[PDB]
Amino acid sequence: SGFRKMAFPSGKVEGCMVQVTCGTTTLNGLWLDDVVYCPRHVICTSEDMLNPNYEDLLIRKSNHNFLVQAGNVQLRVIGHSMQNCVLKLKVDTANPKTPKYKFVRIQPGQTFSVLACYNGSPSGVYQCAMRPNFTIKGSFLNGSCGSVGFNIDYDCVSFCYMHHMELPTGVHAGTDLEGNFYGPFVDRQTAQAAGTDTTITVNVLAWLYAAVINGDRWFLNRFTTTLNDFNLVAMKYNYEPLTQDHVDILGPLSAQTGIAVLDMCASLKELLQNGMNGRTILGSALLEDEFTPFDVVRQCSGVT
Amino acid sequence: SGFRKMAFPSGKVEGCMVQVTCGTTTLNGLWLDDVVYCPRHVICTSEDMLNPNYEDLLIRKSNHNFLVQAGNVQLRVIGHSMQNCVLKLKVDTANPKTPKYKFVRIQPGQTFSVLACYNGSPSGVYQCAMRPNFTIKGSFLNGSCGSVGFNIDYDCVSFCYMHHMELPTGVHAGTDLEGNFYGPFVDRQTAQAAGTDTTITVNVLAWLYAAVINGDRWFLNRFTTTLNDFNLVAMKYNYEPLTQDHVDILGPLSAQTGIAVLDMCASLKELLQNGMNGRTILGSALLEDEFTPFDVVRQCSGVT
Ligand SMILES: Cc1ccncc1NC(=O)Cc1cc(Cl)cc(N[C@H]2CCC[C@@H]2O)c1
Ligand SMILES: Cc1ccncc1NC(=O)Cc1cc(Cl)cc(N[C@H]2CCC[C@@H]2O)c1
């Protein structure tokens, strides 16, 4: 029992972290096979960030301008290319610690672990979610760019995020490993507001199922609802609309607890309308939405 | 910016996890040098857990009864001994992945990361604190015993916890790496109630400083207080008394923000007396107490 915001073990990703320096800028790179992936803004000076023409800036850079260090050893750069907002630095040595990996682009509402790094060295690991407005709420300081987000399925690391930016609002933006930003964000120092940060309803429900599994049952009521009735309340509270696909996804949790999905929806509807009344659920005073139904099943079953 | 419940990178500890089986019982062990450390209840059957005489049970066990597997390879056990509530299994091979390490016994209020494991394999990593009643609020299922808690200082892993038990109340109990339980807990299936779980005041204050650093400033007020006045309110709310040692420990955070410690105490006093009024601080609707002042400095400065 117990339910925690749990991150994946980070060892397989720690073995891929390198430091990339170009001119006066230093950030993190991800070394997989003989390629180092990093944010393309490594080639920019602070003055360049206002209105960068990355293709034009990159012309002035050669392979020897990209300093890649793995631990205390320098890697030799034998090629460089830009793919969307990431640079791919071909090095002469394959990473001996390359795990089995995939590059995946996640959907809003999906969770992943972040290994926050500085100068190619890991500082910590935490769990976060791709928000419905395509931002993430991480913990990143200057130098953290190039830190990656990932999920693990047994021995295969699926990299889904690379950190690029902090918006003026303190929220984070980045790309998948093909260099495409999540959301409408651009790697430029310009006015970029995030969009409405709605609550991931299906994740809230999964977390209520985790609460019942772990003994917190005070919020269970004598009511039921329908998807259309529940969604009228969800709209009012800036919650994402719940679909039959979401109900299907919650099926294993509903089976394990014997609580029908629409009954749990009625419990969530009352929590939205009435509040917690100073009570907590799994040590939280707000409804948690950064656990997917798969995260709950995984944590409650002990998948390694 | 951003502030997350961050765990240490787990790679150095993943390299130490092994599976230990004795008879029908399987749990986790920690392999450091040529010794594997595990909970002594690995020698018990479920019937033995009611009233175990560990010295008597251990007599019936020989080195060949302890099956230690690291990955898919079996380790040869050449000695066994019991130290308090842990067994030390001497193996014929030093762990090649042994990091620089120390065994430390932590004080209540201190935080650490847990690498939850099953069958010697890591499932996840999360951050937790030794509660003032010497329990931890983790996420552990059957088979998680022997999972360890640790802190890292650059390249040295300080192991502080080994998981042994879940109490009937869903809280967790365990030992340091010398086998001494934290708190009054015993490795027996008997009535054991935890004690009052008070709030770690100094950690709450550190987290309020992290909030101000990260822009959440709504709770700052025009007041101040004294240690004695603050503690009258802290007692009423089951908060640990704040001492001058704690004020000294918060010194760097007070210097960084320009907010005197007693002024922050007055803000916390108003939050206790008035509540949050439906507002949040760093994405939380309750006062968070599992970040030490050192955790806040570390996360806000990017220590790797
Ligand atoms: C600072 C940070 C914090 C967290 N995560 C990430 C970061 N870093 C960034 O966003 C990188 C970045 C991206 C853009 Cl579009 C512009 C800049 N401009 C810089 C010129 C002087 C300082 C200012 O940061 C930098
Ligand atoms: C189960 C668990 C969950 C989380 N963390 C840890 C655990 N495991 C434990 O506490 C181990 C343990 C310690 C004591 Cl003192 C007694 C037992 N008795 C068992 C006999 C039948 C089943 C029951 O669990 C087992």
From Swiss-Prot, chains A, B:
Outcome when changing residue 49 to A: Does not affect ability to cleave and inactivate human TRMT1
Regulation: Inhibited by pyridone-containing alpha-ketoamides compounds 13a and 13b. In turn, alpha-ketoamide 13b (tert-butyl (1-((S)-1-(((S)-4-(benzylamino)-3,4-dioxo-1-((S)-2-oxopyrrolidin-3-yl)butan-2-yl)amino)-3-cyclopropyl-1-oxopropan-2-yl)-2-oxo-1,2-dihydropyridin-3-yl)carbamate) inhibits SARS-CoV-2 replication in human lung cells. Inhibited ex vivo by michael acceptor inhibitor N3. Inhibited ex vivo by compound 11a and 11b.
Catalytic reaction annotation: TSAVLQ-|-SGFRK-NH2 and SGVTFQ-|-GKFKK the two peptides corresponding to the two self-cleavage sites of the SARS 3C-like proteinase are the two most reactive peptide substrates. The enzyme exhibits a strong preference for substrates containing Gln at P1 position and Leu at P2 position
Record-annotated Peptidase C30 domain positions: 1-304
Effect of residue 132 to H: In strain: Omicron/BA.1, Omicron/BA.2, Omicron/BA.2.12.1, Omicron/BA.2.75, Omicron/BA.4, Omicron/BA.5, Omicron/BQ.1.1, Omicron/XBB.1.5, Omicron/EG.5.1
Cross-link Glycyl lysine isopeptide (Lys-Gly) (interchain with G-Cter in ubiquitin) residue location(s): 5, 90
Source organism superkingdom: Viruses
Cytoplasmic side: 1-304
Signal peptide: none
Reported function: Cleaves the C-terminus of replicase polyprotein at 11 sites. Recognizes substrates containing the core sequence [ILMVF]-Q-|-[SGACN]. Cleaves and inactivates human TRMT1, preventing tRNA guanine(26)-dimethylation of tRNAs. May cleave human NLRP1 in lung epithelial cells, thereby activating the NLRP1 inflammasome pathway. May cleave human GSDMD, triggering alternative GSDME-mediated epithelial cell death upon activation of the NLRP1 inflammasome, which may enhance the release interleukins 1B, 6, 16 and 18. Also able to bind an ADP-ribose-1''-phosphate (ADRP).
Subunit structure of this chain's protein: 3CL-PRO exists as monomer and homodimer. Only the homodimer shows catalytic activity. Interacts with host FBXO22; this interaction promotes the proteasomal degradation of nsp5.
Name listed for the protein in its UniProt record: 3C-like proteinase nsp5
Lineage: Viruses, Riboviria, Orthornavirae, Pisuviricota, Pisoniviricetes
Parent-record interval covered: 3264 to 3567 of 7096
